[model samples]
Target: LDADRGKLPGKKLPLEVLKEMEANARKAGCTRGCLICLSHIKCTPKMKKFIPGRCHTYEGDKESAQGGIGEAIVDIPEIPGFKDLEPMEQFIAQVDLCVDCTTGCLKGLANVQCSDLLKKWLPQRCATFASKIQGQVDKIKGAGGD
Candidate 1:
């Protein structure tokens, strides 16, 4: 909202803060909740349960660097059951969806704010009941500039 369009506020943390938050994440039962270093304090309750579903601290970086989402898959040694889900269910649950969006999960908050490729490819490649996403999509679109 200031001079820097994509700049983050006070992006780095002191050593003591980092150590303390590492301990806090351990207490949160979170292995990968610290998405961006020092952002652990921003960890939502859902983040505690997130289990680094699709994206994570380091894995997402590699994926994005390589190309885009789904370009690579890194194995999380803790989440062995991830590949067991039904394909569509896996699509629905994985991929760090908005933990802050007011929209319902089944209603497509991920499609609106985050998953551009999913929005581009989902309806084109699969059958769905996702018509409910329009109102929420318009809600966010009208609220921001492209």
Candidate 2:
């Protein structure tokens, strides 16, 4: 829906691609309150504790009966299966990096929480993520957009 706004510093995927991601998020139960995709995707207690719950870009599964937290453990080789993700869903996962690189995160966690993670992986995912981003942006611009 917000593909136009999904101008990640490097990737600028199309609306169709984004739509797929959203559908997947819902199928995966990340849509806290149903397909509306309005509710925040639960975050890990570590993130809440470390980032102080100020994390606006929530992701992952719902809390367990035992009150367990969720988190995005980027095991480089075991990267999250984000082959097809909703635009907003993907954005939420990479918001810190995208926002910090372009317009600070909506919740202001970019400068703080994202600092370390980005510094560590941005360079690693640069060739892949950055190249993919540039391609998406090119597609958008070629079709006509900022």
Candidate 3:
């Protein structure tokens, strides 16, 4: 819905997407929300602690859960097959990497690539989680609204 926003620094959502986002929010027990896509899905405490001080972007948001701006992990809700994991839980969920990567997570992109590698193993990693986002769309839908 907010696709027109492009890859701008920070784009807000338009109406159509917002409608879907809101419906999804109510479904996910969300009282508030946003429109997002699942590009490189990742998030949570396990994701953070499992790779503490590690990140790809030039950011140290002090939280691993902070990294995913438009990845699949952020966009798609957890499916039934996988255990429900916090970003961190999910990060550590894959026993394959946690033990080693967690040691020097903040080391930078090299180790950070482990997450990227995980993306490679998982087919759904690069998917864009496109859904409606809540915004002035509600107002636009109101009577006489533009």
Candidate 4:
């Protein structure tokens, strides 16, 4: 059975908010070539669980850095209301909230604004997922798999 069918009690983001988030992602340099950005566009309740993991390959390895820089080229932007924080910090917070929502772990909000929720979730989930991929990459390298 599809888990996405069980809709969370939170508010859904409006089209305008979603578009704004998309534009923010573009400003953050999420190019079309980036797997994360591609999946970002397809994000929905039905697809949310899969989107956070798109930053890595199916094998759970972090994707190779572009231009051989040994790190992802992404420059995540600050969330709308979280401008006081550094971009990377904002990125982590947002992704963490996203992961919590996807896993049904969040509490104490009734019909919360989607943008607010996204600002809180996206960074945390992304960072958490990225860390996992990086861990896998390190393990392979440690085993002499290159």
Candidate with more favorable, higher lDDT: 1 or 3 = 1
Give the lowest summed-lDDT range of ten residues in model 4: 102-111
What is the Cα root-mean-square deviation between model 1 and the actual structure? 19.4
Which ranges of candidate 1 are over 4 A from the true structure? 1-80, 102-146
Best by lDDT: 4
- Taking all chains together, the TM-score of candidate 3 against the true structure is 0.20
Locate the minimum summed-lDDT window of 10 residues in model 1.
33-42
Per-residue CA lDDT of model 2 for 1-146, tens digit only, reads 46777754535433333333343344444322232222333334444433332333335336533334435432222227533544334435533222223121122322322233333334433334332222233443456456
* Candidate 4 lDDT score at position 144: 40
Q: Which stretches of candidate 3 lie over 4 Å from their true place?
A: 1-39, 57-73, 81-83, 86-89, 92-146
Q: How well does candidate 1 score on lDDT at residue 17?
A: 33
TM for candidate 4 is 0.21
In Å, residue 95's CA in model 3 sits off its true spot by 15
- How many clashing pairs per prediction, in order? 0, 6, 24, 17
State TM-scores per candidate: 0.20, 0.20, 0.20, 0.21
Q: Relative to the true structure, how large is the alpha-carbon lDDT of every model?
A: 0.36, 0.36, 0.35, 0.37
Q: Model 4, range 1-146, lDDT digits (tens) per residue?
A: 34578766435444434444544444444333342433322222333332332222122235543545534322335345544655434444445324313211121122222344344444444334322112233444356435
Write one digit per residue (lDDT tens) for candidate 1, span 1-146.
76568777544433333333344433443223222222212222343334222222333353366564443342223335645754433333443332442323223322332233333323533335353224333343355436
